[PDB]
Design a binder for this molecule. Structure first.
Ligand SMILES: [Cl-]
Ligand code: NA
Ligand code: NA
Ligand code: NA
Ligand code: NA
Ligand code: NA
Length: 1283
RNA sequence: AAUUUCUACUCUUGUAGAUGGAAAUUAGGUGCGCUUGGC
DNA sequence: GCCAAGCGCACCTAATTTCCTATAGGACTG
DNA sequence: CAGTCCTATA
């Protein structure tokens, strides 16, 4: 039966290992003498220049084909609708099939197989497409059919720089196939049209139809937005939101226009933006009238389309010119500063503001658009000035002060500019004083800016800060001048207005200088990057096989446990085999690898037999057999039957499973499969490369059930490596003469002083070349290796005479906090310029300092030029390339192991990650926040790093990365989770994110469990390097992932945190529906009683679940009724003796004590309750709307079981119901058998949603997990278990 | 405070854990500036 | 001061595709 | 006209 250790050797996994390459002997001198590094840098530079030129071909061709597309989209829309309605596997599969059909229909325009075009056009497209993904791209023939474009002389020089080297673009061809492919892939244009943009466009049509049906006037508004923008001029707004127009939204220029219909168009900064549809809808909602509420109740925001793949974006909005150099910015700004001085702008501004002390302020106007900005800059609150003006005007109204009269005053404050005297009279003399202070500060900063000189360059950050500071000062004055109203309606002071307009006009360029300078100064400086090395060999290191060594130039050696890469360059422009000579193992020397590989037999056997041009040519005119002798030890016969099998008139091939699944005749399929497999055996027994391989471990051909099973057993037999000793002198002579470039393959596990555990990656590598792996392959060495040169990129070091400071004190567990660490480090190195702090001096006897005996240099690896080697490997080589039924295999194990524990992993409000481990019945075994791992607080560190990045962006300085810190943290989380998983043999349950540290964590955890090696395990045990665990399903993408990946499960987050762990109770009410006095009374009427319990001091509110249905979320759960309890507000104590108050609630924050507040309410009303009578009829019949609202708010508070206050550290769960045994749950007791806080409660119920999945898998007769967990099923399940 | 590279370290000229590269594309985010509005 | 809808710029981050090849074919060399 | 070696498979 199943075993946990059986989850091994289930599918192949590819990884890349990276190493430094240390040149040996005269290798580096020879490389330098030959100039290989400089010419590879040049070839990389030429590639970077040539790629955008070549992309003109792809972009022009795709755009020309897209302009011809015309499809009927109704069938795809219907398949989308049916899937959305039914949400079944059948309708999902139907939509998937429909998407494939639509992607293919787009694709037929690229390849010229569409009925919608003529034969002549289709043939031209086929001729073009046939040469788009190979070196024919460069001949320029394709240029003749795209337009009148020819290539310039410089373009011809770039093209010629890849003569006999176009396979440098081998990968690029694949990247471009990924653009045109009809497959279901996100890189491709058909996918982009069919699965990204059409659903968006289809939803916009629905949004439009609902909006203009409910509010027909929006039709005219929308049409007028289109006409004002001047786009789609001969298409009505209705047609823009109809399916046939989508055929006109496939090219980027059309997509750009559509998105600007939605989004509008901006001109220069400081001028009015042209509104799009979404802004019009937003403004309509913000009117807050009756129409606004109707619009807001409907979907009211259109969705912009994604870009077309590869296309260049264009905009109708204004684009600033850009500065190009330090001297352009500084000199241009310096000329502007001098103009401002010459124009006496500062002197005039000061004179104007000084005039305000003695001129008539009733003719000085403040812009009503600026009033809240000014209130914020001058007063306590943004609304101080608005409220003061409102109050003053109300006090000037004549007659009765009605509600409409008040509203009129309110609306007038939005519509009219305000004279300065009214503001001063409304707000008082301290507004005047604040006004004077702000003016002086602004003017004084602008003055100091004009007088201060600019730096010589912008190379140093301090120089950038001078520039930014002076720009901030002038922009401040620009903002200040814009406080004043400009409208000609206001009775403006004539001379004051003319002078203000003058200096405003002169201040206008400040805005453009500000934006242009920021756009330049925040650019990332020139950075050193590694580049690929070729040594003038176009096919360098693409394969290791003995037959390709001369042309690929790459070989491997082992000597005394150290590994070496050999590179063999051309000699005087010619390839020349080195022909190393095997010698006895008694001889001093190097072990050279001999690599023997016949790649993927599914393609290589047809390539070398049935698909030969001579075979294909022969079978067009003949039916007799053809015999092959080249590269065969005895002739290989190809019959018409064998040829026809691999070359059917129509797919699928008869020996593929698809022929059996469709045709349904298994006699034909099994015969064809046996005949093909027999043919491969015939081929392999004779082909030069494979004739010597012993294949007798394969089954008789008829016994294989499908071709994938056969190839999965065959391919492992087609790969072998071995070693032969090469004499020392032959290798050293080859390096001495420059015939061999020899590098040690290096990482620090090969350092002389190495003595600890190796990196996992070192273990993969030494495992690969171990005797056991040589005897039977678990790890294969793959071709397509790459070499890089990384120039030095850094210039901080601990020098010999100095001291270093351990981060941990003498006890080797207490870390020194950062500010203390810096102070102590400076102090022990006699660089502290002041007294040691009290706390630092207290720590001083318990620190550990190290004498620097050898220099330790920060970033040392980046301070010199280095060589690097990236080499792919495949682990679990004996398995198939993909698993079959991985999830069912896990579920078979889980059904035989019903005691499998469960690890629940939640993302918290105050915790990055929280884990709860439960046994199979739900008992908590462990629970832990992962904010801190080994006394390092990653939560604090990450929060501090993000604050630093925000401040850096604001200051125009270097933005420090955060992804490396995130990865470092997550690697520690992975280590802990996996260790728990292996120790407990547990399932892991995560939040299904459809319902960022957490999402990246999910991918890293899945990926680790695709191929899990534990470095302490013996190589031959499961989990050791030669037998990795495989506990998750093969990862493809997040989009292509269900709710189970092997031992990992995904569950919906709802009702996992705000749920009572003792009962499964949740707040059943939707509080938005309890909104006025009448609905509050109906709500109270739906409760059986509220009464006081003299025995305990609690109040009991009895609720039947079939009442108050209009106010419920529709989730009746399992229990027919609940006793909701107002707990007596008495002191309780947690496990450590810390007091808390029972029943306390934290509400919007203030502490609330509902039972005490209920008592106070009842005594205010004179309502007798200490006799146990029902309280609700008394409140209802008295009908005091304030008392009834208080009652309802108290009930809502009691039912808010999660209570949080970031200021106090509170985040607890206190249930409003008692459980089976009388207990009202409170996490503040800190009982370690139950959730210790709200986040732990979430992780607990996450795990239990996994338990529900496992229990239903138990009670079923199949191996299929249920897909998803509805909220009612979850609540009924957990409430039934707990009650 | 050393690294294939990342994070955390320093009994240890190095230690513990992690680490699938390269190319290509796309999406999103943060910050700043601005527009019209809401509070 | 916060927020909504939207535009411009700077840079940072993450997801998803492909390949992980010896040999057939034939253009270039001389 | 062969051997070499880049291109593009299957
Ligand atoms: Cl919840
Ligand atoms: Na180590
Ligand atoms: Na990559
Ligand atoms: Na932005
Ligand atoms: Na605004
Ligand atoms: Na904005």
């Amino acid at each position: 039966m199943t075993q946990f250790e059986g989850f091994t050797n289930l599918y192949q996994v590819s990884k890349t290992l990276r190493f430094e390459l240390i040149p040996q002997g005269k290798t580096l001198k020879h490389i330098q003498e030959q100039g290989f590094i400089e010419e590879d840098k040049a070839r990389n530079d030429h590639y970077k220049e040539l790629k955008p030129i070549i992309d003109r071909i792809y972009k022009t061709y795709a755009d020309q084909c897209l302009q011809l597309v015309q499809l009927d989209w109704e069938n795809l829309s219907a398949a989308i609708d049916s899937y959305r309605k039914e949400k079944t596997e059948e309708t999902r599969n139907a939509l998937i099939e429909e998407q494939a059909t639509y992607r293919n229909a787009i694709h037929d325009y690229f390849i010229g197989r569409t009925d919608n075009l003529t034969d002549a056009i289709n043939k031209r497209h086929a001729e073009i497409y046939k040469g788009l993904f190979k070196a024919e791209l460069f001949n320029g023939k394709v240029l003749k059919q795209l337009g009148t474009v020819t290539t310039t002389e410089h373009e011809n020089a770039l093209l010629r720089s890849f003569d006999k080297f176009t396979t440098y673009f081998s990968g690029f061809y694949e990247n471009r196939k990924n653009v045109f492919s009809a497959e279901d892939i996100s890189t491709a244009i058909p996918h982009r049209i069919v699965q990204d943009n059409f659903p968006k466009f289809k939803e916009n049509c629905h949004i439009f139809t609902r909006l203009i049906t409910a509010v027909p006037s929006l039709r005219e508004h929308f049409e007028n937005v289109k006409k004002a923008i001047g786009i789609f001029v001969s298409t009505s707004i209705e047609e823009v939101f109809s399916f046939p127009f989508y055929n006109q939204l496939l090219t980027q220029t059309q997509i750009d226009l559509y998105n600007q219909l939605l989004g509008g168009i901006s001109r220069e900064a400081g001028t009015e933006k042209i509104k799009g549809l979404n802004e019009v809808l937003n403004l309509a909602i913000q009117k807050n009238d009756e129409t606004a509420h109707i619009i807001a109740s409907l979907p009211h925001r259109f969705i912009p389309l994604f870009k077309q793949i590869l296309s260049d974006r264009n905009t109708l909005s204004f684009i600033l010119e850009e500065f190009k150099s330090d001297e352009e910015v500084i000199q241009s700004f310096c000329k502007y500063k001098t103009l401002l001085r010459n124009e006496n702008v500062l002197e005039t501004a000061e004179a104007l503001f000084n005039e305000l002390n003695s001129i008539d302020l009733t003719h000085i106007f403040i812009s009503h658009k600026k009033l809240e900005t000014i209130s914020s800059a001058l007063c306590d609150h943004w609304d101080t000035l608005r409220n003061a003006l409102y109050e003053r005007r109300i006090s000037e109204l004549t007659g009765k002060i009605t509600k409409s009269a008040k509203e009129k005053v309110q609306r007038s404050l939005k519509h009219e500019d305000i004279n300065l005297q009214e503001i001063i009279s409304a707000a008082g003399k301290e507004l005047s004083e604040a006004f004077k202070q702000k003016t002086s500060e602004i003017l004084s900063h602008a003055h100091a800016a004009l007088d201060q000189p600019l730096p010589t360059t912008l190379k140093k950050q301090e120089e950038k800060e001078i520039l930014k500071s002076q720009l901030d000062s002038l922009l401040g004055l620009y903002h200040l001048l814009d406080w004043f109203a400009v409208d000609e309606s206001n009775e403006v002071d004539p001379e004051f207005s003319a002078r203000l307009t003058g200096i405003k006009l002169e201040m206008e360029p400040s805005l453009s200088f500000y934006n242009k300078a920021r756009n330049y100064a925040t650019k990332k400086p020139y950075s050193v990057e590694k580049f690929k090395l070729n040594f003038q060999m176009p096919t360098l290191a693409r394969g290791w096989d003995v037959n390709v060594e001369k042309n690929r130039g790459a070989i491997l050696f082992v000597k005394n446990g150290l590994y070496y890469l050999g590179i063999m360059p051309k000699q005087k422009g010619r390839y020349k085999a080195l022909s190393f000579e095997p010698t006895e193992k008694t001889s001093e020397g190097f072990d050279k690898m001999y690599y023997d590989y016949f790649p993927d037999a599914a393609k290589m056997i047809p390539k070398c037999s049935t698909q030969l041009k001579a075979v294909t040519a022969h079978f067009q005119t003949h039916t007799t057999p053809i015999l092959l002798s080249n590269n065969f030890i005895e002739p290989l016969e190809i019959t018409k039957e064998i040829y026809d099998l691999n070359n059917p008139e129509k797919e699928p091939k008869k020996f593929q499973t698809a022929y059996a699944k469709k045709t349904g005749d298994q006699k034909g399929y099994r015969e064809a499969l046996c005949k093909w497999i027999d043919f491969t055996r015939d081929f392999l027994s004779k082909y030069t490369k494979t004739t010597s391989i012993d294949l007798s471990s394969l089954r008789p051909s008829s016994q294989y059930k499908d071709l994938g099973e056969y190839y999965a057993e065959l391919n492992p037999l087609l790969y072998h490596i071995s070693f032969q000793r090469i004499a020392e002198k032959e290798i050293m002579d080859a390096v001495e003469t420059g015939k061999l470039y020899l590098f040690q393959i290096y990482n620090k596990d090969f350092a002389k002083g190495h003595h600890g555990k190796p990196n996992l990656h070192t273990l993969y590598w030494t495992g690969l070349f171990s005797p056991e792996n040589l005897a039977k392959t678990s790890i294969k060495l793959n071709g397509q290796a790459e070499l890089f040169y990384r120039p030095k990129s850094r210039m901080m070091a601990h020098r010999l005479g100095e001291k270093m400071l351990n981060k941990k004190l003498k006890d080797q567990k207490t870390p020194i906090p950062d500010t203390l660490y810096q102070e102590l480090y400076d102090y022990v190195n006699h660089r502290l310029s002041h007294d040691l702090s009290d706390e630092a001096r207290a720590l001083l006897p318990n620190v550990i300092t190290k004498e620097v005996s050898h220099e330790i240099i920060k970033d040392r690896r980046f301070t010199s030029d280095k060589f690097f080697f990236h080499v792919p490997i495949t682990l679990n080589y004996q398995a198939a390339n993909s698993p079959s039924k991985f999830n069912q295999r896990v579920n078979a194990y889980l059904k035989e192991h019903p005691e499998t524990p469960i690890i629940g992993i939640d993302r918290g409000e105050r915790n990055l990650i929280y884990i709860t481990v439960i046994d199979s019945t739900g008992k908590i075994l462990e629970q832990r926040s992962l904010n801190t791992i080994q006394q390092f607080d990653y939560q604090k560190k990450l929060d501090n790093r993000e604050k630093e990045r925000v401040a850096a962006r604001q200051a125009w300085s270097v933005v420090g990365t955060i992804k490396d810190l995130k990865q470092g943290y997550l690697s520690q989380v992975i280590h802990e989770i996996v260790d728990l998983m292996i120790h407990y043999q547990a399932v892991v349950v995560l939040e299904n994110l459809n319902f960022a540290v957490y999402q990246q964590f999910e991918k890293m955890l899945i990926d680790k469990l695709n191929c899990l090696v534990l470095k302490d395990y013996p190589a031959e045990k499961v989990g050791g390097v030669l037998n990795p665990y495989q506990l998750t399903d093969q990862f493809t993408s997040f989009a292509k992932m269900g709710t189970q990946s092997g031992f990992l499960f995904y569950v919906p987050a709802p009702y996992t945190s705000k749920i009572d762990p003792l009962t499964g109770f949740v707040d059943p009410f939707v509080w938005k529906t309890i909104k006025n006095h009448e609905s509050r009374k109906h709500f109270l009427e739906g409760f059986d009683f509220l009464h006081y319990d003299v025995k305990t001091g609690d109040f009991i509110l009895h609720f039947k679940m079939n009442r108050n249905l209009s106010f419920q979320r529709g989730l009746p759960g399992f229990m027919p009724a609940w006793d909701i309890v107002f707990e007596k507000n008495e002191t309780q104590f947690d496990a450590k003796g810390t007091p808390f108050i029972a029943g306390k609630r934290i509400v919007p924050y203030r502490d609330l004590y509902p039972a005490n507040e209920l008592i106070a309410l009842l005594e205010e009303k004179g309502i007798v309750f200490r006799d146990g009578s029902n309280i609700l009829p008394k409140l209802l019949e008295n009908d005091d709307s304030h008392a009834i609202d208080t009652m309802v708010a108290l009930i809502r508070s009691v039912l808010q079981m999660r209570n949080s206050n970031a200021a106090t550290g509170e985040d607890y769960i206190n249930s409003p119901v008692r459980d089976l045994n009388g207990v009202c749950f409170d996490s503040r007791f800190q009982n370690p058998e139950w959730p210790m806080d709200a986040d732990a409660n979430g992780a607990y119920h996450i795990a239990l949603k996994g338990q529900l999945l496992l229990n239903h898998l138990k009670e079923s007769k199949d191996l299929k997990l249920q897909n998803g967990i509805s909220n009612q099923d979850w609540l009924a399940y957990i409430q039934e278990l707990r009650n």
